[PDB]
Amino acid sequence: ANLRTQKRLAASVVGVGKRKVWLDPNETSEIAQANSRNAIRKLVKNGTIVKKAVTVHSKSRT
Amino acid sequence: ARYGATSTNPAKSASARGSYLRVSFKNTRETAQAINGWELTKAQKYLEQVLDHQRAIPFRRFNSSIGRTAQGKEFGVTKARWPAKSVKFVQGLLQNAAANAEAKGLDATKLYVSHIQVNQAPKQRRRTYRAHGRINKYESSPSHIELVVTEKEE
């Protein structure tokens, strides 16, 4: 359907911004039913959604 | 359910019509004169080829300053173009005319388009903005299309 509700919610429930939420490309028949907020914490613990790690800006040459 | 000038018998002819269709008018006239007098098999092969970028539609009347292409050579003229919106709006009416032809016993082995015409619909207006703060008009030119199919005989 249209997951632009859930990718907005998954920054507010996690704490990282919007651009770091990795939703699931295979379970969109299930993520689209997590309308309210307190079902997203039933999915982050399930691993349907994963916070991507911080892109590295090393300082080693500096 | 009044039609235009029809020189055929209205007992062996199915009919089709599309009103207030938001396509161009100067393109639908040219496409609806490309097919006037063709079988409903070669006509649909033609209107499948025009989208497939062979056998272009010739622009006879509404044709000033358009570019030249080679594929109008089979119709004689040298100004040809492929209006892919008006082809899609005419082919639906040909498909509707076949489904009305099959509801009267008219077999599809000898059908041809007898009476086909476009008409300047009521304009649908919008506005555009030019320099120095002046509103000029900016309108669409929709078309009514009428189309009667009938079968060839002796």
Binding site: - | Q124, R125, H132, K137
Partner: protein
Amino acid sequence: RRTITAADRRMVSGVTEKQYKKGMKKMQQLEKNAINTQIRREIKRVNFQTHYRDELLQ
């Protein structure tokens, strides 16, 4: 936990959601016809900027 929707009151008093679509389509067509005929007139008498400049002297 509702037994009341949007449609629950209006299905009883007159209209029906199939005929509501046959009413909603008629207003948006008549809104077009009343907004077409205003732009059929205002485009003529709108370039009359009464304090123009004509910005070309020397």
